[PDB]
């Protein structure tokens, strides 16, 4: 709500205030994926924020935490058996995919970081063994499996394991350094910490008229059919801005929204960051390996209020109060599910993720009739789910938003129940369809009990028998739900 995030944030304040000025400037919702201090210390010292090259994120241990490893214990994969070699192959494939940018370079850190982390209580300067032509500045940590080995002048950490003990990886070495990769900014060696991130971008409800050159808004608004008016608003935004473009440098947004990401980049160009592109990959769901559920989401609004949520239940609560539930915009992360169900890109990942554990799916890489009737059905599911995940409906009142959203769920539920009414359905795909079916039922019905319409879902489903359209059978849905 302000300062309660500033005291337990782990981020830097100058980026926050220079985001506050652009929040007042072009009125967008800069939603944060907050990271800890162990990367933004060296970010404020001026070392690079990596893109999607290696996925060694903010580790919590050491003055070289946040920094990318070669021996991957210096990341979240700390204490794992086969994941460390998988990350070693990840950096050996990041050199072969992001070549020209990625090298195998020694480090460059500022030496005040060790005295910064004598006071966070992790590292204990203990025994000394003589090497490298000096009294070597050794220090152990709260773990002793791998130490750090720094001289007071050089910017290389030439670590070793203790040869009196054994390792956990299965291999041994001499005092061999963590060779780090880099965002080599035209030959300048810049190693990589866990990057400065985002959670979402969302302008105001009328700044799309200040984002779209509004001479298409000049021809969209004047139209006589109100349902077709909202559909002429919405289909234009599907053909303009839903179609995200991914890369390996900046993240996953559209054209105007990466045009706002360069202003979110100019927020740090004048205040202590020299690594260039500061927004590089966003939230936990902007990660392309597996999702994570974060419990602290730092909302600054178009006013710039330094608000943090409490947990994910309260995060969805605040989202449905103000972020979507007020006159605002929700450009989002594309058996007890209370408020939410996952998304359609999550549905496509879930779709192509489970037909390899079991060889048979009900539709596969084939050429038959019912499998591609099912493909057209599931394309209709994706379209109906894109228009159910739609906060472009507050040009009308919130009752119209709920009406549009659940008519989308009705049309999707019709085909979801219909494709189960088929031949022999594989039980994984059968229970996956029912797994989505019970929750889409409860998502409509929890809306309806949070509405004032009171009908059961099944009666509302059986009174509507739409042929193909949402141009006539929305009027019968209207005349059922209207007058209260």
Q: Which is the catalytic residue, given 15, 55, 78, 98?
A: 55
Q: Rounded to an integer, what distance in angstroms lies between the CA atom of residue 398 and that of residue 325?
A: 8
**Cα→Cα distances 207→10, 122, 211, 306, 324, Å:** 31, 48, 6, 22, 15
Q: Rounded to an integer, what distance in angstroms lies between the CA atom of residue 434 and that of residue 342?
A: 15
Determine whether the annotation assigns residue 60 to a binding site: no
Q: State whether residue 3 is helix, strand or coil.
A: helix
Buried b (16+ CB within 10 A) or exposed e, 290-305: eeeebebbbbbbbebe
Determine whether the annotation assigns residue 78 to a binding site: no
Determine whether the annotation assigns residue 195 to a binding site: yes
Tally the C-alpha atoms within 13 A of residue 211's C-alpha that lie toward its C-beta: 21
Determine whether the annotation assigns residue 343 to a binding site: no
Determine whether the annotation assigns residue 96 to a binding site: no
Beta bridge partners of 185: 188
**Alpha-helix residue ranges (DSSP H) falling in 277-362:** 312-318, 344-353
Determine whether the annotation assigns residue 327 to a binding site: no
* H helices, E strands: number in the chain: 15, 10
Q: Rounded to an integer, what distance in angstroms lies between the CA atom of residue 256 and that of residue 265?
A: 14
**55 tagged catalytic:** yes
Tokens 């996953």, residue? 252
For residue 341, the 8-state DSSP code is: -
Contact 385, 412 (CB under 8 A): yes
Q: Which residues contact 149 (CB under 8 A, 6 or more apart)?
A: 136, 138, 157, 158, 159, 160, 175, 177
- Strand positions, DSSP E, 426-476: none
Q: State whether residue 110 is helix, strand or coil.
A: coil
Sign of CA dihedral 211, 212, 218, 223: negative
Contact 61, 77 (CB under 8 A): no
Q: Rounded to an integer, what distance in angstroms lies between the CA atom of residue 325 and that of residue 294?
A: 21
Q: Which residues contact 359 (CB under 8 A, 6 or more apart)?
A: none
Q: Rounded to an integer, what distance in angstroms lies between the CA atom of residue 157 and that of residue 176?
A: 9
Task: Pick out the residues of the known binding site for 3',5'-cyclic AMP.
Answer: 252, 281-283
Could you tell me which residues are annotated as the binding site? 195, 197, 252, 281-283
The residues annotated as belonging to the active site are 55
Q: Which residues are annotated as a binding site for Mg(2+)?
A: 195, 197, 281
């Amino acid at each position: 709500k302000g300062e309660k995030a500033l005291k337990a944030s782990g981020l830097v304040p100058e980026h926050a205030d220079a985001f506050k000025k652009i929040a007042r400037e072009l009125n967008t919702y800069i939603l944060f994926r907050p990271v800890n201090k162990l990367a933004t210390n060296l970010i404020k010292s001026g070392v690079a924020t990596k893109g999607l090259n290696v996925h060694g994120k903010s580790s919590d241990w050491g003055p070289v935490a946040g920094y990318i490893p070669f021996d991957q214990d210096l990341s979240k994969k700390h204490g794992q058996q086969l994941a460390v070699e998988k990350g070693n192959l990840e950096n050996k494939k990041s050199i072969t995919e992001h070549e020209g940018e990625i090298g195998k370079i020694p480090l460059k850190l500022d030496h005040l970081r060790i005295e910064e982390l004598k006071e966070n209580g992790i590292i204990l300067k203990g025994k000394k063994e003589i090497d490298n032509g000096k009294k070597y500045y050794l220090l152990e940590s709260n773990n002793q499996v791998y130490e750090f080995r720094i001289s007071d002048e050089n910017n290389e950490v030439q670590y070793k394991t203790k040869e009196g003990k054994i390792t956990v990886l299965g291999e041994k070495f001499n005092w061999r350094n963590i060779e780090v990769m880099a965002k080599n900014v035209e030959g300048v060696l810049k190693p990589l910490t866990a990057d400065y991130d985002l959670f979402a971008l969302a302008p105001s409800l009328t700044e799309i008229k200040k984002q779209i050159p509004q001479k298409e808004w000049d021809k969209v608004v004047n139209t006589p059919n109100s349902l077709e008016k909202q559909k002429g608003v919405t289909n234009l935004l599907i053909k303009y801005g839903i179609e995200r473009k991914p890369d390996s440098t900046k993240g996953t947004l559209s054209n105007w929204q990466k045009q706002m990401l360069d202003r979110l980049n100019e927020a740090v160009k004048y205040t202590g960051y020299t690594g260039g592109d500061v927004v590089n990959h966003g939230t936990e769901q902007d990660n392309e390996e597996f999702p994570e559920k974060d419990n602290e989401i730092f909302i600054i609004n178009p006013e710039g209020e330094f608000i943090l949520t409490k947990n994910w239940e309260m995060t969805g609560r605040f989202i449905e109060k103000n972020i979507t539930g007020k006159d605002y915009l929700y450009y989002f992360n594309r058996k007890a599910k209370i408020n939410t169900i996952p998304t359609s890109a999550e549905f496509i990942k879930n779709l192509s993720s489970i037909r390899r554990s079991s060889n048979v799916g009900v539709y596969k890489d084939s050429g038959d009739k019912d499998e591609f009737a099912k493909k057209e059905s599931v394309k209709k599911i994706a379209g109906y789910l894109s228009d159910y995940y739609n906060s472009a409906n507050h040009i009308f009142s919130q009752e119209k938003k709920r009406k549009i959203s659940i008519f989308r769920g009705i049309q999707a539920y019709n085909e979801i129940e219909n494709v189960l009414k088929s031949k022999q359905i594989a039980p994984e795909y059968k229970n996956y369809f029912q797994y989505l079916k019970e929750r889409i039922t409860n998502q409509v019905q929890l809306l309806l009990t949070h509405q004032k319409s009171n009908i059961e879902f099944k009666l509302l489903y059986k009174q509507l028998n739409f042929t193909e359209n949402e141009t006539d059978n929305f009027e019968v849905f209207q005349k059922i739900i209207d007058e209260k």
